[PDB]
Every structure is written in C-alpha cells, then in structure tokens.
Amino acid sequence: DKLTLWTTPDPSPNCKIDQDKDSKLTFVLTKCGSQILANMSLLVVKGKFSMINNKVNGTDDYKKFTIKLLFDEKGVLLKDSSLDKEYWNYRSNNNNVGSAYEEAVGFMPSTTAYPKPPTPPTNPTTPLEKSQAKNKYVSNVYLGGQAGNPVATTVSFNKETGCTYSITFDFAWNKTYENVQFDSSFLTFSYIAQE
Amino acid sequence: DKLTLWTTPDPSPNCKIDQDKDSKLTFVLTKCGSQILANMSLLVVKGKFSMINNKVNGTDDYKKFTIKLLFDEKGVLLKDSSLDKEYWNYRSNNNNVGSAYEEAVGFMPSTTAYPKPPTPPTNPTTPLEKSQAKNKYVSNVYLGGQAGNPVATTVSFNKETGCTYSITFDFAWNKTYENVQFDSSFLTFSYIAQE
Amino acid sequence: DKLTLWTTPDPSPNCKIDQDKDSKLTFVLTKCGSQILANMSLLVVKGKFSMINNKVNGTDDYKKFTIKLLFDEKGVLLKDSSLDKEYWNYRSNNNNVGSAYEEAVGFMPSTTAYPKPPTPPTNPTTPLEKSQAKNKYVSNVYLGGQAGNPVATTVSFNKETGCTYSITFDFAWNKTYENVQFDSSFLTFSYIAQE
Numbered sequence: 001d002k003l004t005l006w007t008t009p010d011p012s013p014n015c016k017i018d019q020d021k022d023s024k025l026t027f028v029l030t031k032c033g034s035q036i037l038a039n040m041s042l043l044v045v046k047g048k049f050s051m052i053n054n055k056v057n058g059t060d061d062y063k064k065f066t067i068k069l070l071f072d073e074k075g076v077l078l079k080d081s082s083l084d085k086e087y088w089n090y091r092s093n094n095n096n097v098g099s100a101y102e103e104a105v106g107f108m109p110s111t112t113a114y115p116k117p118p119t120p121p122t123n124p125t126t127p128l129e130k131s132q133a134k135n136k137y138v139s140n141v142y143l144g145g146q147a148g149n150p151v152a153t154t155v156s157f158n159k160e161t162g163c164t165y166s167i168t169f170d171f172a173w174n175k176t177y178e179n180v181q182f183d184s185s186f187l188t189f190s191y192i193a194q195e
Numbered sequence: 196d197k198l199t200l201w202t203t204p205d206p207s208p209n210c211k212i213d214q215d216k217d218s219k220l221t222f223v224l225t226k227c228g229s230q231i232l233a234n235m236s237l238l239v240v241k242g243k244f245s246m247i248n249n250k251v252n253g254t255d256d257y258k259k260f261t262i263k264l265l266f267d268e269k270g271v272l273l274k275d276s277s278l279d280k281e282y283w284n285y286r287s288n289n290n291n292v293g294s295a296y297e298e299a300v301g302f303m304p305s306t307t308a309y310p311k312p313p314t315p316p317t318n319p320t321t322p323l324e325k326s327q328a329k330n331k332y333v334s335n336v337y338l339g340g341q342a343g344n345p346v347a348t349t350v351s352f353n354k355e356t357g358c359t360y361s362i363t364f365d366f367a368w369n370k371t372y373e374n375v376q377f378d379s380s381f382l383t384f385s386y387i388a389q390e
Numbered sequence: 391d392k393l394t395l396w397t398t399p400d401p402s403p404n405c406k407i408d409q410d411k412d413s414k415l416t417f418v419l420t421k422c423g424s425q426i427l428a429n430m431s432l433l434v435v436k437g438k439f440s441m442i443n444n445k446v447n448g449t450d451d452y453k454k455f456t457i458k459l460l461f462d463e464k465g466v467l468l469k470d471s472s473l474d475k476e477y478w479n480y481r482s483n484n485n486n487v488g489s490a491y492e493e494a495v496g497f498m499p500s501t502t503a504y505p506k507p508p509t510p511p512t513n514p515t516t517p518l519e520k521s522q523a524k525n526k527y528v529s530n531v532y533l534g535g536q537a538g539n540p541v542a543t544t545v546s547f548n549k550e551t552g553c554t555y556s557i558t559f560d561f562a563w564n565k566t567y568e569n570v571q572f573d574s575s576f577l578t579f580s581y582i583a584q585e
Contacts, residue, residue, distance in 0.1 A: 004426070026201065030423055033225055034198070036234055059361050091424055125246060127240060128376055128378060130219075131219075131236060131378050133378040138341075138342055142523065144522060144523050145528055170233050172342075181518055185523050186527055190234055228394055229396070230427055319569060322571050328536075329530065333574055347537045389417055
C-alpha cells in the first residue's frame with residue numbers, strides 16, 4: 001500500500017482561497033494505525049493575503065479566511081475543496097505512473113471520534129451532555145516564521161456539509177499587519193482515524 | 196497485538212474529578228515504537244466545571260483541577276485513577292469479546308526518560324545537575340474550541356506516588372470565566388516509551 | 391534496522407552552547423515512514439544559562455542562544471554540531487556493542503520539503519513565489535515546566551552552511567528572568583523525511 005497521502009511536490013500553486021491558484025498549500029498525512037499524523041504549511045501568492053496590509057484594509061473580512069478539504073465516503077477529495085484534486089495523491093510506490101486513483105478511508109478523521117456536532121441548547125447556562133469542542137485542534141502559525149506574527153488557526157473535523165468527511169482550516173488574527181505575506185510556519189497535530 | 200490503547204467509545208461518562216462520572220475523558224495512545232503518540236479531549240458534564248462561573252466562585256480552587264492516570268508495573272490502570280478502568284482497553288483485534296485484560300508496558304512513559312525527580316537544592320540560585328522540568332509537556336486547550344478560552348494544561352509523567360507509572364493532567368486558568376462549560380479542544384503530544 | 395535515533399541515555403552532559411559540556415540535550419527522532427517524529431528537552435548546567443539573571447545581565451546576547459545539529463550526505467552528525475557525536479546513535483538492536491556507526495538518511499529532513507531558501511526580494515512589498523517560513527516550526531518551551539516561564543523556540547530545517555542536512559534550535563525570550571535555570575519542558579513536532 002502507501003502510508004503517506006499528501007500534496008504532491010510541484011513548484012505550482014494548488015489551492016483557492018478566493019481565486020484559482022491563490023495559494024500553495026503543503027499538507028502531509030502519515031498514518032500510524034489509529035492516528036493520522038498531519039503537517040501543514042501555507043503560502044498565498046496572490047489575492048488578499050499575499051502581502052497583508054490591515055492599515056489599508058482593516059475590516060473583519062481582511063483578517064480571516066478558510067480552507068476546506070472535503071472527502072467522499074471512500075476518502076476521495078471532492079472538486080469543491082480548496083485544494084486542487086490534481087495535486088493530491090499518495091506518495092510514490094505503485095502510484096508513480098499509476099497516477100491519481102483512490103480509496104483512502106484509513107486517512108479520514110473518524111466519524112465516531114468526530115461526529116456531526118449536536119445542536120447547542122437554547123440556554124448557554126445549560127451544560128452539554130456531549131462535546132461541541134472535541135473536533136477542533138486550536139493552535140497558531142507564524143507568518144514569516146516570526147514569533148511576532150501569529151495567526152490563530154482552528155483545524156476542525158467533519159463539520160462541513162458537502163461531503164462525508166472534512167478537514168477544515170480556519171485562520172484569523174487581531175494584529176493589524178502592515179505589509180506581511182501570509183507565509184506560515186508549519187503546524188503539526190494528529191487525529192483519530194476511521195478504518 | 197494491538198498498537199492503540201484508548202478510552203473505549205461509549206456515550207457514558209468515564210472520569211472523576213471530584214464526584215463519580217463528573218467527566219467524559221477522551222484519551223488515545225498509539226505506539227510508534229519508541230514514542231507513544233497521545234491525543235486528548237475533556238468534557239465535564241456536572242460538578243464545578245460543567246458551566247464555570249468565576250464571577251460567582253472566584254477562589255483558586257475554582258480555577259484549577261487535576262486528572263490522574265495511574266499504572267502498575269505491567270501498565271494496568273489502578274482503581275484510584277481519575278479514569279474508570281471499565282472504559283480503558285486496547286482497540287478491537289482479539290480484544291473485542293476478550294474484554295478487559297492487560298499487559299501494556301510499551302505504552303508506559305519511560306522511567307529512564309521520566310524518572311522520579313530529584314530533590315531541588317536548598318538554594319534556588321544553585322543550578323541543577325539533572326532536570327526538574329523534563330517530564331512535563333506544558334501547552335494549552337481551548338474551552339468551546341475558542342481561541343479566547345485558553346486553559347493552561349500541564350501533562351506530567353511518573354510524578355504520582357500510588358503506582359509504577361503515571362500520566363497526570365493539571366489544568367488551570369487566570370481568565371475569570373463567566374458561564375463557560377469545560378469542553379476542551381484536543382491536545383496532541385508524544386512521549387518516550389519504556390519497553 | 392532501528393527506527394529511533396536519539397541521544398543515548400548517559401548521566402553526562404553532551405552539548406555545547408558556548409563551552410564544552412555546557413548543556414545536556416535530550417533529543418529523540420522516531421521514524422514513521424514519511425514523517426520523523428521529534429521530542430526534545432534541554433538542561434544547561436553551567437555557562438550563561440544555568441541560572442539566568444537578566445536584571446544583572448540584560449543585553450540581547452543574554453536572552454537568546456542556539457543549538458545546531460549538522461549532518462553529512464549520509465545523515466551522520468558532524469563534529470561542529472552543538473551535540474557531541476559520542477552521545478548520538480540509534481537505539482539498542484544490533485547497535486548495542488556495534489557502537490557508533492551510521493547511515494541515517496531516512497531521519498533527515500527532506501531537502502525537497504525544506505530546501506535552501508531563496509533570496510528574499512529587494513522590496514518587501516513584493517510577494518514571494520516560494521516560502522521563506524515553511525522550514526520552521528515556531529513554538530515554546532517552559533523553563534522549570536512553569537507556564538509563566540516561556541521561551542520562544544524556533545526549530546529550523548536545512549538552513550545552516552556546514553553540511554548537507556541541518557536541524558537548528560533557536561531559543562529567545564523577552565521576560566527579564568531573575569535567577570531561573572534553563573531547564574525546559576519538552577517540545578514535540580514532526581517533520582518530512584527525505585529517503
């Protein structure tokens with residue numbers, strides 16, 4: 001088989017935030033049985049977040065954006081994802097000139113560990129019987145790889161509607177950045193796999 | 196064998212902070228030879244930390260709590276842990292209707308890498324010859340999965356006295372939370388295994 | 391083979407920041423195919439950062455330092471690294487009284503994922519076509535394992551000149567520490583491997 005499903009190395013951009021080939025997403029999933037081991041970088045090369053300036057454009061919509069990975073019931077990427085299908089496959093093996101095939105359910109984030117979330121009660125004083133938060137990793141990345149340029153990053157599992165599985169990346173910051181390209185330090189986490 | 200030792204999926208709560216079935220701890224250990232790969236979520240469903248309000252209860256004891264995993268010399272959970280033994284076993288395999296057995300030493304945190312810590316010198320100006328900190332991962336979780344609701348989380352290895360190995364989770368915050376359920380984003384780290 | 395390449399357990403110090411045996415670096419690499427799984431602790435036992443006091447020594451050079459791992463084209467440590475070669479090998483196996491040998495290319499950080507970085511344009515307004523940040527994990531450690539004692543830590547891949555591969559650890563803080571030994575909580579991340 002192959003145990004690593006990733007963003008094939010091409011010099012080309014492969015991702016759309018607002019416009020086609022906005023961005024070059026690096027994303028690597030390596031399977032350790034029950035946990036998938038994730039690593040991700042993001043470079044946005046044109047559009048609103050290549051060179052950010054919030055002194056100029058300070059409205060909320062210029063300080064957050066989202067990226068969506070959307071899979072079918074067999075773990076194949078759907079057209080409507082942010083990531084272009086052509087740049088997403090397993091690593092080498094008998095998948096070198098076997099080219100873009102799939103099944104990949106063992107790389108999907110468990111619908112048991114990460115279910116469709118319930119509807120939060122009417123009263124927020126009322127405590128939950130089951131978790132709204134448990135499908136989110138909330139961490140940071142650093143633009144330019146500089147400690148001074150944080151971007152709050154929320155990875156969320158199986159919360160999108162297009163699909164059967166989903167990995168969603170929601171970035172957002174408060175710092176009023178002045179001329180700073182969105183070019184991220186990498187983020188590493190792990191998640192519970194389906195089978 | 197099985198390589199993943201975890202909190203069996205049950206809708207039921209499985210953990211005690213102050214009272215029996217206070218809390219529903221999700222905790223997954225996946226073994227990659229020398230490193231154990233950990234993932235953890237926490238939902239507290241009744242007690243002091245289901246709905247936190249520190250405008251009402253502002254004393255130090257309402258802004259910190261602890262969870263303890265305690266193992267014997269073979270890597271079996273002891274009764275006195277926060278986590279209920281009945282909800283802790285390997286993942287499926289020949290352990291589906293083989294039910295709660297164990298040995299699990301390869302999932303234990305190394306007593307060589309994480310020893311009983313020495314006694315810190317009389318003078319704190321005096322520098323150490325061996326580490327007090329090296330058995331702690333110190334990170335955060337996010338209540339509601341919201342960047343604005345951090346909780347400082349200190350995972351500590353083999354520091355408890357009941358036992359032969361130990362994984363301890365010490366949560367604590369300064370934010371004066373007003374009506375906020377302790378429902379955590381997940382935390383991922385790795386640790387050095389025994390054998 | 392062996393899948394874990396690490397800092398052999400010895401009570402002795404094994405690392406040089408400014409002077410020989412300054413420091414006792416714990417560092418463990420465990421290979422999961424395409425990703426290397428890293429874990430690191432640091433104790434500095436003499437020199438400037440055993441007992442830090444920035445009320446006394448407040449200049450920039452007393453609030454940052456660096457550690458370098460430098461490998462040849464086969465993944466062998468070079469003399470000039472911060473880490474002493476004698477304390478760095480695979481874990482047991484047929485490498486117990488086979489002693490210090492190597493090849494270890496599969497533990498090296500990919501020169502495809504982590505290349506020699508390009509030269510940042512003349513104008514910083516000009517947006518990049520390829521990433522300057524993508525070879526850095528930027529995170530923290532906690533001196534004494536205390537949430538109140540952060541140290542910003544930047545792990546950087548293949549940026550040094552002595553060598554063919556490199557893992558570099560750049561620590562730095564703003565807090566004016568008063569009498570606090572540099573004794574770190576551990577840091578865990580993963581990185582993309584070569585082959």
